């Protein structure tokens, strides 16, 4: 049964596993009566989610919208109200911390003295 | 046995699987006699590799350098000559096409008429 | 991009487990629906060659192509009908036959590098 | 960041299969080596709760901590010695017991959405 608490839990559990997006999309479409609150929760949770989890939220929106069309235009219309905000948020958050693995790599190298501090500084500056 | 052809093949097969980097690092360290050509091939192949494959090449360099230290300083020294170039290349390539999934998403939405052209244009502009 | 079996092989070798990668390739395959026969044939050839951890994405791609091809014509539904059961069967067998592969590859790393003594590896190995 | 079992649980829940994620968490655990006992205890508790596809990363993290902890002291080598065999055994059992999970989840999607008739699903299902 649908509950906003059940949704927060499934969104929190939304992983990188290939089945994750489509499995959740099936449950969301079964509960299309609640399309408005679903999108409201999705939007709130997309903003709260970490930089690396955000892009999977848009994949979820894409799968839900595309597959909901054969059932009703409610998901298409509900998502339409938040998508400009959603895309602009993910696009700037993608930019801010795109080199996060590179920054993390140099931090590991510094802390584990993989190279000397001067060489670390050259690598940092090269970014 | 080591061959630059055997290396190109293993680098080409270097995937996202958790074991991929450390498994290849074991073979590269066994063949540390060839550290110079290994790094030369790695560097050439890192540049030829696609944007999404490039970061795994640096993870490979990190694992090789860290683990080679108990055997000899050759990998540390050989990598030192190319790392400023390697990091600067990955850091700009990360930036150029960070929003590649977002750009690809909008292209799917346009082509599959998920939303009308005017709404697609708003989403594009929001990036 | 103009259709060719070589272009398709390169696209399948670069296919990743991401939704945007499956769906971007799916757009190109449906644009080239005139070649559904050769497309399905190459897809199946490349699926069998593919690494155990890459096989599942091929099935996600087939489903995305079939579902989205319907509004364009019956070509892909028809072409995949004859191979999808065998394609799924292959993935079913290979997933069982290569299930222990990540733990075996992990153990291989630990046999070579772990600082715990020899009996520890045997204990891990026995657990499997 | 100051050490706490709650901070560690949050860090483990955000731990990804990427090298930079395993190694960044590993830096923090070795900095907090004074708490090796409680760290290993939480790690093991969180590994068992973790989704089948997330379990393997915990083992990569344990190995990175043990290898890099040595130059700092014997705390982590000592603490992981007593649990790593059981931790590995759990992953060995769960990988076999949940091997067919991705194909089963794929079939679940196709049962709900596929445009091929009912007999097709049964044929896929029989292949497993
Ligand atoms: Cl509710
Ligand atoms: Cl549905
Ligand atoms: Cl050679
Ligand atoms: Cl080694
Ligand atoms: Cl299409
Ligand atoms: Cl450390």
UniProtKB/Swiss-Prot annotation, chains A, B:
Physiological role: Interacts with phosphorylated C-terminal heptapeptide repeat domain (CTD) of the largest RNA polymerase II subunit POLR2A, and participates in dephosphorylation of the CTD by RPAP2. Transcriptional regulator which enhances expression of CCND1. Promotes binding of RNA polymerase II to the CCDN1 promoter and to the termination region before the poly-A site but decreases its binding after the poly-A site. Prevents RNA polymerase II from reading through the 3' end termination site and may allow it to be recruited back to the promoter through promotion of the formation of a chromatin loop.
Domain CID positions: 1-127
Subunit field text: Homodimer. May form a heterodimer with RPRD1A. Associates with RPAP2. Associates with the RNA polymerase II complex.
Protein's name according to its UniProt entry: Regulation of nuclear pre-mRNA domain-containing protein 1B
Tissues and organs where the protein is expressed, per its UniProt entry: Preferentially expressed in a range of tumor tissues including colon, lung, liver, breast, prostate, stomach, uterine endometrium and cervical cancers with higher levels in tumors than in adjacent non-tumor tissue (at protein level).
Record family assignment: Belongs to the UPF0400 (RTT103) family.
Effect of residue 112 to A: Complete loss of binding to POLR2A CTD in vivo
Domain of life according to the entry: Eukaryota
Part of the intact protein present: 3 to 129 of 326
Entry's localization field: Nucleus
Swiss-Prot record, chains C, D:
Positions of the CID domain: 1-128
Localization of this protein: Nucleus
PTM-bearing positions, type N-acetylserine: 1
Tissues where the protein occurs: Preferentially expressed in a range of tumor tissues including colon, lung, liver, breast, prostate, stomach, uterine endometrium and cervical cancers with higher levels in tumors than in adjacent non-tumor tissue (at protein level).
Domain of life according to the entry: Eukaryota
Family: Belongs to the UPF0400 (RTT103) family.
Quaternary context: Homodimer. May form a heterodimer with RPRD1A. Associates with RPAP2. Associates with the RNA polymerase II complex.
Record function comment: Interacts with phosphorylated C-terminal heptapeptide repeat domain (CTD) of the largest RNA polymerase II subunit POLR2A, and participates in dephosphorylation of the CTD by RPAP2. Transcriptional regulator which enhances expression of CCND1. Promotes binding of RNA polymerase II to the CCDN1 promoter and to the termination region before the poly-A site but decreases its binding after the poly-A site. Prevents RNA polymerase II from reading through the 3' end termination site and may allow it to be recruited back to the promoter through promotion of the formation of a chromatin loop.
Name of this protein: Regulation of nuclear pre-mRNA domain-containing protein 1B
UniProt organism field: Homo sapiens
Highest classification ranks of the organism: Eukaryota, Metazoa, Chordata, Craniata, Vertebrata
